[PDB]
Amino acid sequence: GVIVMGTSADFPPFEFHKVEGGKDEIVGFDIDIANAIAKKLGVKLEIKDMDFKGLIPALQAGRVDMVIAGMTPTAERKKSVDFSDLYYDSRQVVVVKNDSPISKFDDLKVKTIAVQIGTTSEEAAKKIPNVKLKQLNRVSDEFMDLQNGRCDAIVVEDTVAKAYLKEYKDMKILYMDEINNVENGSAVAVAKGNKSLLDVVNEVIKELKQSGEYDKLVDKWFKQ
Ligand SMILES: NC(=[NH2+])NCCC[C@H](N)C(=O)O
């Protein structure tokens, strides 16, 4: 009577902790999608918050039934788990301080770049010549690093950077063509061979899109 979802709730507006009024709720676009799935199945949704890097291992081990975490369905990951249809696009960007000497992609050479372990953002940064990778479990620490001068830049998705920059007013996004040369988009992951759940997930994503509910969710999370 339960479906267990794994996520990494450091990724507003997809999943994050909204802490106010005596509540600590994990909320976001991905959570709304998860609740639509739970409702179709007629079960209770339980969410486990963990480091992003642990999500695929948890799914493989059966510690969660599905992962929704702004997760890109890469060819590499498809060897290990199964992915739903895409439910949102995404783009890699670079975040720097307002007074950064970095203006363009070439300027990233030899720099210290904060990235989240196990991500396409990390994959993108690894291609920078002579990069000094600073690898973090959680995105929130990457922003603390940049604020405190412990890195020169962050690589992270555009929509998430925009969310963090609501608070981090001394940072800016650089839209560099070349940093986005990785697989894009987000999809739901389920364990390899779990067709029953995958089919339901794909049906729910399709019905969200076709019923108008998806557009309501997108307005709520991405059009503010
Ligand atoms: N909840 C998160 N921290 N998500 C990170 C996702 C980053 C990137 N889209 C990936 O699939 O690797």
PDB file of C-alpha atoms and ligand atoms in Angstrom:
ATOM      1  CA  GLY A   1       0.000   0.000   0.000  1.00  0.00           C
ATOM      2  CA  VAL A   2       3.052   2.244  -0.373  1.00  0.00           C
ATOM      3  CA  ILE A   3       5.285   3.465  -3.161  1.00  0.00           C
ATOM      4  CA  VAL A   4       8.710   4.622  -2.042  1.00  0.00           C
ATOM      5  CA  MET A   5      10.461   7.348  -4.007  1.00  0.00           C
ATOM      6  CA  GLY A   6      14.108   8.319  -3.753  1.00  0.00           C
ATOM      7  CA  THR A   7      15.145  11.890  -4.422  1.00  0.00           C
ATOM      8  CA  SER A   8      17.861  14.414  -3.608  1.00  0.00           C
ATOM      9  CA  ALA A   9      15.971  17.417  -2.239  1.00  0.00           C
ATOM     10  CA  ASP A  10      18.646  20.028  -2.899  1.00  0.00           C
ATOM     11  CA  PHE A  11      17.281  20.897  -6.319  1.00  0.00           C
ATOM     12  CA  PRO A  12      14.582  23.602  -6.301  1.00  0.00           C
ATOM     13  CA  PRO A  13      12.100  23.838  -7.977  1.00  0.00           C
ATOM     14  CA  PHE A  14      12.146  20.074  -8.675  1.00  0.00           C
ATOM     15  CA  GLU A  15      12.589  18.922  -5.092  1.00  0.00           C
ATOM     16  CA  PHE A  16      13.515  20.864  -1.995  1.00  0.00           C
ATOM     17  CA  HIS A  17      12.696  21.270   1.682  1.00  0.00           C
ATOM     18  CA  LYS A  18      10.082  23.919   2.359  1.00  0.00           C
ATOM     19  CA  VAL A  19      10.526  24.625   6.054  1.00  0.00           C
ATOM     20  CA  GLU A  20       7.935  26.959   7.547  1.00  0.00           C
ATOM     21  CA  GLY A  21       4.864  27.083   9.760  1.00  0.00           C
ATOM     22  CA  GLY A  22       6.061  24.091  11.758  1.00  0.00           C
ATOM     23  CA  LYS A  23       6.452  21.904   8.686  1.00  0.00           C
ATOM     24  CA  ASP A  24       9.405  20.338   6.901  1.00  0.00           C
ATOM     25  CA  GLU A  25       7.921  19.233   3.593  1.00  0.00           C
ATOM     26  CA  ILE A  26       9.758  17.941   0.551  1.00  0.00           C
ATOM     27  CA  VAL A  27       8.013  19.763  -2.290  1.00  0.00           C
ATOM     28  CA  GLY A  28       8.470  20.659  -5.949  1.00  0.00           C
ATOM     29  CA  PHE A  29       7.605  19.759  -9.524  1.00  0.00           C
ATOM     30  CA  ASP A  30       8.979  16.239  -9.110  1.00  0.00           C
ATOM     31  CA  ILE A  31       6.982  15.758  -5.922  1.00  0.00           C
ATOM     32  CA  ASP A  32       3.752  16.793  -7.639  1.00  0.00           C
ATOM     33  CA  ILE A  33       4.492  14.227 -10.347  1.00  0.00           C
ATOM     34  CA  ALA A  34       5.227  11.597  -7.688  1.00  0.00           C
ATOM     35  CA  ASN A  35       1.933  12.293  -5.988  1.00  0.00           C
ATOM     36  CA  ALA A  36       0.097  11.923  -9.299  1.00  0.00           C
ATOM     37  CA  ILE A  37       1.737   8.511  -9.693  1.00  0.00           C
ATOM     38  CA  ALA A  38       0.870   7.490  -6.123  1.00  0.00           C
ATOM     39  CA  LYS A  39      -2.747   8.551  -6.698  1.00  0.00           C
ATOM     40  CA  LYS A  40      -3.037   6.507  -9.905  1.00  0.00           C
ATOM     41  CA  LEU A  41      -1.736   3.478  -8.010  1.00  0.00           C
ATOM     42  CA  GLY A  42      -3.999   4.160  -5.009  1.00  0.00           C
ATOM     43  CA  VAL A  43      -1.082   4.023  -2.578  1.00  0.00           C
ATOM     44  CA  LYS A  44       0.694   6.177   0.002  1.00  0.00           C
ATOM     45  CA  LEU A  45       3.797   8.017  -1.208  1.00  0.00           C
ATOM     46  CA  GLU A  46       6.895   7.821   0.965  1.00  0.00           C
ATOM     47  CA  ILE A  47       9.920   9.925   0.074  1.00  0.00           C
ATOM     48  CA  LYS A  48      13.510   9.112   1.030  1.00  0.00           C
ATOM     49  CA  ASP A  49      15.902  12.069   0.756  1.00  0.00           C
ATOM     50  CA  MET A  50      19.484  11.039  -0.003  1.00  0.00           C
ATOM     51  CA  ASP A  51      22.618  12.213  -1.803  1.00  0.00           C
ATOM     52  CA  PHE A  52      21.984  12.217  -5.561  1.00  0.00           C
ATOM     53  CA  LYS A  53      24.864   9.780  -6.122  1.00  0.00           C
ATOM     54  CA  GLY A  54      23.059   7.144  -4.030  1.00  0.00           C
ATOM     55  CA  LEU A  55      19.812   7.217  -6.008  1.00  0.00           C
ATOM     56  CA  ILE A  56      20.603   4.670  -8.717  1.00  0.00           C
ATOM     57  CA  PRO A  57      22.266   2.284  -6.218  1.00  0.00           C
ATOM     58  CA  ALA A  58      19.201   2.556  -3.951  1.00  0.00           C
ATOM     59  CA  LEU A  59      16.908   1.761  -6.879  1.00  0.00           C
ATOM     60  CA  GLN A  60      19.055  -1.216  -7.919  1.00  0.00           C
ATOM     61  CA  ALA A  61      18.979  -2.510  -4.345  1.00  0.00           C
ATOM     62  CA  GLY A  62      15.202  -2.144  -4.083  1.00  0.00           C
ATOM     63  CA  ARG A  63      15.476   0.408  -1.277  1.00  0.00           C
ATOM     64  CA  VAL A  64      13.213   2.685  -3.347  1.00  0.00           C
ATOM     65  CA  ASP A  65      10.685   1.844  -6.082  1.00  0.00           C
ATOM     66  CA  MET A  66      11.306   4.884  -8.274  1.00  0.00           C
ATOM     67  CA  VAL A  67      13.563   7.903  -8.477  1.00  0.00           C
ATOM     68  CA  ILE A  68      12.377  11.359  -9.462  1.00  0.00           C
ATOM     69  CA  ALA A  69      15.210  13.858  -9.077  1.00  0.00           C
ATOM     70  CA  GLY A  70      15.563  15.943 -12.227  1.00  0.00           C
ATOM     71  CA  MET A  71      17.425  12.896 -13.471  1.00  0.00           C
ATOM     72  CA  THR A  72      18.679  12.700 -17.040  1.00  0.00           C
ATOM     73  CA  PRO A  73      18.069   9.398 -18.857  1.00  0.00           C
ATOM     74  CA  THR A  74      21.644   8.948 -20.112  1.00  0.00           C
ATOM     75  CA  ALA A  75      22.695   6.008 -22.268  1.00  0.00           C
ATOM     76  CA  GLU A  76      25.081   5.011 -19.478  1.00  0.00           C
ATOM     77  CA  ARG A  77      22.367   4.987 -16.814  1.00  0.00           C
ATOM     78  CA  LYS A  78      20.008   3.025 -19.085  1.00  0.00           C
ATOM     79  CA  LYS A  79      22.362   0.046 -18.723  1.00  0.00           C
ATOM     80  CA  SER A  80      21.475  -0.070 -15.019  1.00  0.00           C
ATOM     81  CA  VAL A  81      17.904   1.235 -14.632  1.00  0.00           C
ATOM     82  CA  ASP A  82      14.882   1.946 -16.853  1.00  0.00           C
ATOM     83  CA  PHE A  83      13.614   5.449 -17.634  1.00  0.00           C
ATOM     84  CA  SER A  84      10.224   6.918 -18.391  1.00  0.00           C
ATOM     85  CA  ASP A  85       9.517   9.299 -21.212  1.00  0.00           C
ATOM     86  CA  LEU A  86      11.013  12.749 -20.637  1.00  0.00           C
ATOM     87  CA  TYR A  87       8.817  15.054 -18.545  1.00  0.00           C
ATOM     88  CA  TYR A  88      10.924  18.243 -18.694  1.00  0.00           C
ATOM     89  CA  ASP A  89      13.851  19.664 -20.651  1.00  0.00           C
ATOM     90  CA  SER A  90      17.048  20.923 -19.007  1.00  0.00           C
ATOM     91  CA  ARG A  91      20.180  22.944 -19.769  1.00  0.00           C
ATOM     92  CA  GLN A  92      23.608  23.092 -18.095  1.00  0.00           C
ATOM     93  CA  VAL A  93      24.909  26.520 -17.166  1.00  0.00           C
ATOM     94  CA  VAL A  94      27.814  28.017 -15.250  1.00  0.00           C
ATOM     95  CA  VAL A  95      27.347  30.075 -12.076  1.00  0.00           C
ATOM     96  CA  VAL A  96      29.993  32.608 -10.969  1.00  0.00           C
ATOM     97  CA  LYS A  97      30.168  35.625  -8.662  1.00  0.00           C
ATOM     98  CA  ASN A  98      29.153  38.969 -10.162  1.00  0.00           C
ATOM     99  CA  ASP A  99      32.763  40.185 -10.146  1.00  0.00           C
ATOM    100  CA  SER A 100      34.226  36.966 -11.524  1.00  0.00           C
ATOM    101  CA  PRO A 101      37.042  37.164 -14.085  1.00  0.00           C
ATOM    102  CA  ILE A 102      35.308  34.327 -15.961  1.00  0.00           C
ATOM    103  CA  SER A 103      33.303  35.473 -19.018  1.00  0.00           C
ATOM    104  CA  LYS A 104      33.443  32.581 -21.434  1.00  0.00           C
ATOM    105  CA  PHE A 105      34.047  28.856 -21.785  1.00  0.00           C
ATOM    106  CA  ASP A 106      37.783  29.192 -22.492  1.00  0.00           C
ATOM    107  CA  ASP A 107      38.175  30.997 -19.147  1.00  0.00           C
ATOM    108  CA  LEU A 108      37.195  27.817 -17.281  1.00  0.00           C
ATOM    109  CA  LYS A 109      40.563  26.216 -18.032  1.00  0.00           C
ATOM    110  CA  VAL A 110      42.619  25.412 -14.910  1.00  0.00           C
ATOM    111  CA  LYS A 111      39.775  26.632 -12.666  1.00  0.00           C
ATOM    112  CA  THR A 112      38.246  25.030  -9.573  1.00  0.00           C
ATOM    113  CA  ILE A 113      34.733  23.977 -10.546  1.00  0.00           C
ATOM    114  CA  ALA A 114      32.144  22.745  -8.034  1.00  0.00           C
ATOM    115  CA  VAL A 115      29.876  19.933  -9.250  1.00  0.00           C
ATOM    116  CA  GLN A 116      27.510  17.351  -7.815  1.00  0.00           C
ATOM    117  CA  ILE A 117      28.891  13.820  -7.651  1.00  0.00           C
ATOM    118  CA  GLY A 118      27.279  11.413 -10.092  1.00  0.00           C
ATOM    119  CA  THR A 119      25.720  14.009 -12.375  1.00  0.00           C
ATOM    120  CA  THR A 120      25.756  15.160 -15.975  1.00  0.00           C
ATOM    121  CA  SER A 121      26.962  18.499 -14.568  1.00  0.00           C
ATOM    122  CA  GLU A 122      30.039  16.678 -13.288  1.00  0.00           C
ATOM    123  CA  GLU A 123      30.404  14.948 -16.676  1.00  0.00           C
ATOM    124  CA  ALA A 124      30.346  18.356 -18.369  1.00  0.00           C
ATOM    125  CA  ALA A 125      32.934  19.877 -16.028  1.00  0.00           C
ATOM    126  CA  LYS A 126      35.319  16.926 -16.447  1.00  0.00           C
ATOM    127  CA  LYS A 127      35.832  17.935 -20.080  1.00  0.00           C
ATOM    128  CA  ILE A 128      37.266  21.341 -19.153  1.00  0.00           C
ATOM    129  CA  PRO A 129      41.034  21.370 -19.815  1.00  0.00           C
ATOM    130  CA  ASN A 130      43.083  21.102 -16.594  1.00  0.00           C
ATOM    131  CA  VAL A 131      39.927  21.440 -14.505  1.00  0.00           C
ATOM    132  CA  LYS A 132      40.231  21.161 -10.741  1.00  0.00           C
ATOM    133  CA  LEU A 133      37.014  19.366  -9.852  1.00  0.00           C
ATOM    134  CA  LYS A 134      35.472  20.069  -6.459  1.00  0.00           C
ATOM    135  CA  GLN A 135      33.007  17.233  -5.898  1.00  0.00           C
ATOM    136  CA  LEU A 136      30.022  17.652  -3.580  1.00  0.00           C
ATOM    137  CA  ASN A 137      27.231  15.366  -2.398  1.00  0.00           C
ATOM    138  CA  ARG A 138      24.645  18.160  -2.368  1.00  0.00           C
ATOM    139  CA  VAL A 139      24.076  21.192  -4.565  1.00  0.00           C
ATOM    140  CA  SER A 140      23.571  23.443  -1.543  1.00  0.00           C
ATOM    141  CA  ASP A 141      27.252  22.994  -0.641  1.00  0.00           C
ATOM    142  CA  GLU A 142      28.341  23.978  -4.146  1.00  0.00           C
ATOM    143  CA  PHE A 143      26.650  27.329  -3.699  1.00  0.00           C
ATOM    144  CA  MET A 144      28.235  27.757  -0.279  1.00  0.00           C
ATOM    145  CA  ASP A 145      31.609  27.021  -1.905  1.00  0.00           C
ATOM    146  CA  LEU A 146      31.120  29.693  -4.551  1.00  0.00           C
ATOM    147  CA  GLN A 147      29.867  32.224  -2.005  1.00  0.00           C
ATOM    148  CA  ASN A 148      32.939  31.584   0.154  1.00  0.00           C
ATOM    149  CA  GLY A 149      35.479  31.615  -2.688  1.00  0.00           C
ATOM    150  CA  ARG A 150      36.249  27.896  -2.383  1.00  0.00           C
ATOM    151  CA  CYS A 151      35.630  27.442  -6.102  1.00  0.00           C
ATOM    152  CA  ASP A 152      35.676  29.644  -9.183  1.00  0.00           C
ATOM    153  CA  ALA A 153      32.439  28.403 -10.708  1.00  0.00           C
ATOM    154  CA  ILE A 154      29.587  25.917 -10.403  1.00  0.00           C
ATOM    155  CA  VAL A 155      28.110  23.778 -13.183  1.00  0.00           C
ATOM    156  CA  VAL A 156      24.413  23.114 -12.593  1.00  0.00           C
ATOM    157  CA  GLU A 157      21.072  23.202 -14.401  1.00  0.00           C
ATOM    158  CA  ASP A 158      19.668  26.590 -15.392  1.00  0.00           C
ATOM    159  CA  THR A 159      16.340  26.367 -13.578  1.00  0.00           C
ATOM    160  CA  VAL A 160      18.041  25.287 -10.371  1.00  0.00           C
ATOM    161  CA  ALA A 161      20.642  28.065 -10.616  1.00  0.00           C
ATOM    162  CA  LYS A 162      17.792  30.565 -10.991  1.00  0.00           C
ATOM    163  CA  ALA A 163      16.166  29.247  -7.821  1.00  0.00           C
ATOM    164  CA  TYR A 164      19.368  29.507  -5.772  1.00  0.00           C
ATOM    165  CA  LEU A 165      20.112  32.986  -7.131  1.00  0.00           C
ATOM    166  CA  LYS A 166      16.880  34.282  -5.579  1.00  0.00           C
ATOM    167  CA  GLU A 167      18.879  34.156  -2.343  1.00  0.00           C
ATOM    168  CA  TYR A 168      22.426  34.380  -3.671  1.00  0.00           C
ATOM    169  CA  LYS A 169      22.137  37.915  -5.024  1.00  0.00           C
ATOM    170  CA  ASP A 170      25.863  38.290  -5.718  1.00  0.00           C
ATOM    171  CA  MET A 171      25.905  35.462  -8.270  1.00  0.00           C
ATOM    172  CA  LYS A 172      25.103  35.340 -11.988  1.00  0.00           C
ATOM    173  CA  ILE A 173      24.469  32.686 -14.617  1.00  0.00           C
ATOM    174  CA  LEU A 174      26.711  32.393 -17.663  1.00  0.00           C
ATOM    175  CA  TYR A 175      25.002  30.694 -20.605  1.00  0.00           C
ATOM    176  CA  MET A 176      27.915  28.955 -22.320  1.00  0.00           C
ATOM    177  CA  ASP A 177      27.122  26.859 -25.391  1.00  0.00           C
ATOM    178  CA  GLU A 178      29.901  24.389 -24.781  1.00  0.00           C
ATOM    179  CA  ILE A 179      29.085  23.426 -21.193  1.00  0.00           C
ATOM    180  CA  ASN A 180      25.728  22.060 -22.361  1.00  0.00           C
ATOM    181  CA  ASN A 181      27.263  19.322 -24.552  1.00  0.00           C
ATOM    182  CA  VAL A 182      25.808  16.512 -22.430  1.00  0.00           C
ATOM    183  CA  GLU A 183      22.540  14.587 -22.520  1.00  0.00           C
ATOM    184  CA  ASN A 184      19.613  16.745 -21.379  1.00  0.00           C
ATOM    185  CA  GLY A 185      16.137  16.394 -19.930  1.00  0.00           C
ATOM    186  CA  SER A 186      14.592  14.715 -16.897  1.00  0.00           C
ATOM    187  CA  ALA A 187      12.794  11.365 -16.609  1.00  0.00           C
ATOM    188  CA  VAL A 188      11.565   8.991 -13.901  1.00  0.00           C
ATOM    189  CA  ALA A 189      13.798   6.011 -13.120  1.00  0.00           C
ATOM    190  CA  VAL A 190      12.606   2.567 -12.062  1.00  0.00           C
ATOM    191  CA  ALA A 191      14.483  -0.669 -11.458  1.00  0.00           C
ATOM    192  CA  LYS A 192      15.599  -2.617 -14.517  1.00  0.00           C
ATOM    193  CA  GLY A 193      12.700  -4.754 -15.725  1.00  0.00           C
ATOM    194  CA  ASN A 194      10.000  -3.200 -13.558  1.00  0.00           C
ATOM    195  CA  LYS A 195       7.662  -2.804 -16.521  1.00  0.00           C
ATOM    196  CA  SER A 196       4.487  -2.706 -14.435  1.00  0.00           C
ATOM    197  CA  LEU A 197       5.590   0.463 -12.656  1.00  0.00           C
ATOM    198  CA  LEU A 198       7.251   1.970 -15.732  1.00  0.00           C
ATOM    199  CA  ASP A 199       4.040   1.633 -17.743  1.00  0.00           C
ATOM    200  CA  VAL A 200       2.006   3.351 -15.027  1.00  0.00           C
ATOM    201  CA  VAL A 201       4.582   6.152 -14.784  1.00  0.00           C
ATOM    202  CA  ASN A 202       4.490   6.722 -18.515  1.00  0.00           C
ATOM    203  CA  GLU A 203       0.699   6.699 -18.513  1.00  0.00           C
ATOM    204  CA  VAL A 204       0.597   9.260 -15.690  1.00  0.00           C
ATOM    205  CA  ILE A 205       3.087  11.570 -17.410  1.00  0.00           C
ATOM    206  CA  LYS A 206       1.049  11.333 -20.616  1.00  0.00           C
ATOM    207  CA  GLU A 207      -2.227  11.994 -18.803  1.00  0.00           C
ATOM    208  CA  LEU A 208      -0.745  14.971 -16.941  1.00  0.00           C
ATOM    209  CA  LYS A 209       0.293  16.443 -20.283  1.00  0.00           C
ATOM    210  CA  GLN A 210      -2.920  15.642 -22.120  1.00  0.00           C
ATOM    211  CA  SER A 211      -5.344  16.710 -19.362  1.00  0.00           C
ATOM    212  CA  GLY A 212      -4.036  20.194 -18.680  1.00  0.00           C
ATOM    213  CA  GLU A 213      -2.635  19.248 -15.272  1.00  0.00           C
ATOM    214  CA  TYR A 214       0.982  19.309 -16.488  1.00  0.00           C
ATOM    215  CA  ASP A 215       0.675  22.867 -17.681  1.00  0.00           C
ATOM    216  CA  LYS A 216      -0.784  23.886 -14.312  1.00  0.00           C
ATOM    217  CA  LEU A 217       2.229  22.301 -12.575  1.00  0.00           C
ATOM    218  CA  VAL A 218       4.697  23.964 -14.933  1.00  0.00           C
ATOM    219  CA  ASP A 219       3.113  27.376 -14.353  1.00  0.00           C
ATOM    220  CA  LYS A 220       3.273  26.860 -10.598  1.00  0.00           C
ATOM    221  CA  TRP A 221       6.957  25.880 -10.464  1.00  0.00           C
ATOM    222  CA  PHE A 222       8.651  27.387 -13.525  1.00  0.00           C
ATOM    223  CA  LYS A 223       6.700  30.479 -14.560  1.00  0.00           C
ATOM    224  CA  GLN A 224       7.157  32.603 -11.443  1.00  0.00           C
TER     225      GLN A 224
HETATM  226  N1  LIG B   1      18.077  16.329  -7.317  1.00  0.00           N
HETATM  227  C1  LIG B   1      19.242  16.502  -7.912  1.00  0.00           C
HETATM  228  N2  LIG B   1      20.291  16.883  -7.202  1.00  0.00           N
HETATM  229  N3  LIG B   1      19.347  16.283  -9.217  1.00  0.00           N
HETATM  230  C2  LIG B   1      20.575  16.438  -9.983  1.00  0.00           C
HETATM  231  C3  LIG B   1      20.350  16.114 -11.451  1.00  0.00           C
HETATM  232  C4  LIG B   1      21.503  16.590 -12.312  1.00  0.00           C
HETATM  233  C5  LIG B   1      21.469  16.059 -13.746  1.00  0.00           C
HETATM  234  N4  LIG B   1      20.166  16.382 -14.385  1.00  0.00           N
HETATM  235  C6  LIG B   1      21.713  14.561 -13.748  1.00  0.00           C
HETATM  236  O1  LIG B   1      20.830  13.782 -14.103  1.00  0.00           O
HETATM  237  O2  LIG B   1      22.800  14.105 -13.397  1.00  0.00           O
END
